[PDB]
């Protein structure tokens, strides 16, 4: 046979990666749960594995950028990069990550409400802010914050995922304009993202406000951002008319309503994130401190 030397534990061997479960599909990718069992004894770490539907030059370039981004991040509230697998005899690329048992925050909130109180919601809020502070130190703009894109390790820890839209700000620039085809999560977008395709830390703060709103609605059927905005706009509107009305609504101070049972001071945080004036939105550091002070002021 042959000798073996492993000095790159970020390279996962295809033959040792065994399928456990399908986890989901996005626009251009899918994710599976696998076991990595190099000792072939039916044991090994469980991992999440992302693969591209169609490895076009463009899709692959974007996927490699996503991998580089995730690899560059090391923080308790960001999904952990583990490595890559060069499958199909090294003619396909897969991204290996830690597996988070409770899936998306959006699904967790919907299915495990017996386990969730306002204290928990504020803990998740704080962790999301801290993850976002960390992204800011690398000049990364996420562009797709939403509860469906946050993952849940356990009762006490959530992690930001979904870095396939992330942009890197050059040192002398404060926004990134991105002209892209296809669909946008318009009900999470800042007005300047809708009108000018401009993205920035401040546009992530806007979307964070929508995330906070989502948390305090407990993902109740008719209370979602798309459901509430469509109610306001007119439920029968279709196509570009939805966008025209959403922009006009937001520009003149139309906003998502205070969720039932949501404390006025939590709604105030949302409203401050949803400032048309980009420079007046709070920073993620401001938000983390405020939320942790709210948490700490409780009797226990
Ligand atoms: C768009 O789909 C995905 C799917 C998985 C991931 C991902 C990335 C990196 C790590 C990671 N851990 C989990 N865990 C997970 C656990 C349970 C579920 N369920 C969804 C399907 N349900 C019917 C069962 C639970 C989904 C994901 N998902 N996940 C990201 C996007």
Curated annotation (Swiss-Prot):
- Residues binding ATP are 23-31, 50
What does the UniProt record tell us about how this protein is modified after translation? Answer: Autophosphorylated, leading to regulate its activity. Autophosphorylation on Tyr-36, Tyr-134 and Tyr-140 in response to growth hormone (GH) are required for maximal kinase activity. Also phosphorylated by TEC. Phosphorylated on tyrosine residues in response to interferon gamma signaling. Phosphorylated on tyrosine residues in response to a signaling cascade that is activated by increased cellular retinol.
Q: Taking every annotated instance into account, which residue ranges of this chain make up the domain Protein kinase?
A: 17-292
What GO terms describe the biological role, i.e. biological process, of this protein?
actin filament polymerization; activation of Janus kinase activity; adaptive immune response; apoptotic process; axon regeneration; cell adhesion; cell differentiation; cell surface receptor signaling pathway via JAK-STAT
Question: Principal localization?
Answer: membrane
**Residues with Phosphotyrosine modification:** 36, 134, 140, 175-176
Where does this polypeptide localize?
Endomembrane system; Cytoplasm; Nucleus
Tell me a Gene Ontology molecular-function term this record carries.
signaling receptor activator activity
Cellular component (GO) terms are: caveola; cytoplasm; cytoplasmic side of plasma membrane; cytoskeleton; cytosol; endosome lumen; euchromatin; extrinsic component of cytoplasmic side of plasma membrane
Task: Tell me which UniProt keywords the record has, alphabetically.
Answer: Adaptive immunity, ATP-binding, Chromatin regulator, Chromosomal rearrangement, Cytoplasm, Disease variant, Immunity, Innate immunity, Kinase, Magnesium, Membrane, Metal-binding, Nucleotide-binding, Nucleus, Phosphoprotein, Proto-oncogene, Repeat, SH2 domain, Transferase, Tyrosine-protein kinase, Ubl conjugation
* Tissues where this protein is expressed: Ubiquitously expressed throughout most tissues.
Keyword Repeat attributed: yes
Q: Which domain of life is it from?
A: Eukaryota
Q: Which residues are responsible for catalysis?
A: 144 (proton acceptor)
| The protein's assembly and partners | Interacts with EPOR, LYN, SIRPA, SH2B1 and TEC. Interacts with IL23R. Interacts with SKB1. Interacts with STAM2. Interacts with IFNGR2 (via intracellular domain). Interacts with LEPR (Isoform B). Interacts with HSP90AB1; promotes functional activation in a heat shock-dependent manner. Interacts with STRA6. Interacts with RHEX; this interaction occurs in a erythropoietin (EPO)-dependent manner. Interacts with ASB2; the interaction targets JAK2 for Notch-induced proteasomal degradation. Interacts with MPL/TPOR.
Pathology noted in the record is: Chromosomal aberrations involving JAK2 are found in both chronic and acute forms of eosinophilic, lymphoblastic and myeloid leukemia. Translocation t(8;9)(p22;p24) with PCM1 links the protein kinase domain of JAK2 to the major portion of PCM1. Translocation t(9;12)(p24;p13) with ETV6. Budd-Chiari syndrome: A syndrome caused by obstruction of hepatic venous outflow involving either the hepatic veins or the terminal segment of the inferior vena cava. Obstructions are generally caused by thrombosis and lead to hepatic congestion and ischemic necrosis. Clinical manifestations observed in the majority of patients include hepatomegaly, right upper quadrant pain and abdominal ascites.
Q: What is known of its domains?
A: Possesses 2 protein kinase domains. The second one probably contains the catalytic domain, while the presence of slight differences suggest a different role for protein kinase 1.
Q: What functional role does this protein have?
A: Non-receptor tyrosine kinase involved in various processes such as cell growth, development, differentiation or histone modifications. Mediates essential signaling events in both innate and adaptive immunity. In the cytoplasm, plays a pivotal role in signal transduction via its association with type I receptors such as growth hormone (GHR), prolactin (PRLR), leptin (LEPR), erythropoietin (EPOR), thrombopoietin receptor (MPL/TPOR); or type II receptors including IFN-alpha, IFN-beta, IFN-gamma and multiple interleukins.
> Member of which family?
Belongs to the protein kinase superfamily. Tyr protein kinase family. JAK subfamily.
Q: What protein is this chain from? A: Tyrosine-protein kinase JAK2
The gene designation is JAK2
């Amino acid at each position: 046979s042959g000798a073996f030397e492993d000095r790159d534990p970020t390279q996962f061997e295809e033959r040792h990666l065994k399928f456990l479960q399908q986890l989901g599909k996005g626009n251009f990718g899918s994710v599976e749960m696998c076991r990595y069992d190099p000792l072939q004894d039916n044991t090994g770490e469980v991992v999440a594995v992302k693969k591209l539907q169609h490895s076009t030059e463009e899709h692959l370039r974007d996927f490699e950028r996503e991998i580089e981004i995730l690899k560059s991040l090391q923080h308790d509230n960001i999904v952990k990069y583990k490595g890559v697998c060069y499958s199909a005899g090294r003619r396909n690329l897969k991204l290996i990550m830690e597996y988070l048992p409770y899936g998306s925050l959006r699904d967790y909130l919907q299915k495990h409400k017996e386990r969730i109180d306002h204290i928990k919601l504020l803990q998740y809020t704080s962790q999301i802010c801290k993850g976002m502070e960390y992204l800011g130190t690398k000049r990364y703009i996420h562009r797709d914050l939403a509860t469906r894109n946050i993952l849940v390790e356990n009762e006490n820890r959530v992690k930001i995922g979904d870095f396939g839209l992330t942009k890197v700000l050059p040192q002398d620039k404060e926004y990134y304009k991105v002209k892209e085809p296809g669909e946008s999560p318009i009900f999470w977008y800042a007005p300047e993202s809708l009108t000018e395709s401009k993205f920035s830390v401040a546009s992530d703060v806007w979307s964070f406000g929508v995330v906070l709103y989502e948390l305090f609605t407990y993902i109740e059927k008719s209370k979602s951002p798309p459901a509430e905005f469509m109610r306001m706009i007119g439920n029968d509107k279709q196509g570009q008319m939805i966008v025209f009305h959403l922009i006009e609504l937001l520009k003149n101070n139309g906003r998502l309503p205070r969720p039932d049972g949501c404390p006025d001071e939590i709604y105030m945080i949302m409203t401050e994130c949803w400032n048309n004036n980009v420079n007046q939105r709070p920073s993620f550091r401001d938000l983390a401190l405020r939320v942790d002070q709210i948490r700490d002021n409780m009797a226990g």
